[PDB]
Ligand binder design. Structure first.
Ligand SMILES: C[C@]12CCC(=O)C=C1CC[C@@H]1[C@@H]2CC[C@]2(C)C(=O)CC[C@@H]12
Ligand SMILES: C[C@]12CCC(=O)C=C1CC[C@@H]1[C@@H]2CC[C@]2(C)C(=O)CC[C@@H]12
Ligand SMILES: [Cl-]
Ligand SMILES: [Cl-]
Ligand SMILES: [Mg+2]
Ligand SMILES: [Mg+2]
Lengths: 129, 130
């Protein structure tokens, strides 16, 4: 793949959600360019390169009990960037919860993720009331 | 207001769509910083200049038949930023249409939009069922 077109970005970003949904760490990390960055949440220090990004997904996901699902379409540009809204389901205080997140992802020429930025906070965490 | 809290982001961003939907250009342009930038769509170069931004909202909304509504929660950071998903309704090519967009914003200590970036392209355009 060359630089993804809009249409390609949409496909790549959907794929990435499934891969979080099924917890495949090696297939996610392989989607990232070798020298990519993660900011998640945006505002925290970035993470640099595949070693540091695999250590991140293994912390966040490795324990299981995390599902994800797109909660609308992928918005996609003509420069290799897109953004998507989704919901994470996991466990908070021994019980289910939902976290609502938006990721913005810039791709390089090769169809991999150069930069990821995940917009969420505690205001986006919900439970059963 | 100083950077805005996350809860506060959220308010500035829902209020902003509320304004877009009502079509108040001058209300919309004031929410910005003297030196704000818009990138809409992301990837097209920034515009800049309060006047360069009123004309942006004047070109975009000046018929009065645009509508806009959040389609899920604003996602806000603790560093004065947020992201939001919304759906724009308008007529184009004689057809009832809709556009799905995500805007990313930052703000300033005073709660003025400092940057904005609107993610969307023609892949997000569609025709509304009858
Ligand atoms: C890494 C992650 C998924 C991939 C993605 O793109 C965005 C996020 C951000 C929220 C993470 C989540 C994984 C599960 C996490 C670690 C929790 O249990 C608390 C916060 C949450
Ligand atoms: C300016 C705008 C609303 C405010 C906002 O926050 C983001 C956008 C970007 C898409 C614009 C839309 C207004 C209506 C436009 C001009 C169309 O008819 C096609 C593209 C679309
Ligand atoms: Cl949506
Ligand atoms: Cl949503
Ligand atoms: Mg699945
Ligand atoms: Mg490279």
């Amino acid at each position: 793949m060359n630089l993804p077109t809009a249409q390609e970005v949409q496909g790549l970003m959907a794929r990435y959600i499934e891969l979080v949904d099924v917890g495949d760490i090696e297939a996610i990390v392989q989607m990232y360019a070798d020298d990519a960055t993660v900011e998640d949440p945006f505002g925290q220090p970035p993470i640099h390169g595949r070693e540091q990004i695999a250590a991140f997904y293994r912390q966040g996901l490795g324990g299981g009990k995390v599902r994800a699902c797109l909660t609308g379409p992928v918005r996609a540009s003509h420069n290799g960037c897109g953004a998507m809204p989704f919901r994470v389901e996991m466990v908070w205080n021994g019980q289910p919860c939902a976290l609502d997140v938006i990721d913005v992802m810039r791709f390089d020429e090769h169809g991999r993720i150069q930069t990821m930025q995940a917009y969420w906070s505690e205001v986006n965490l919900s439970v059963r009331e």
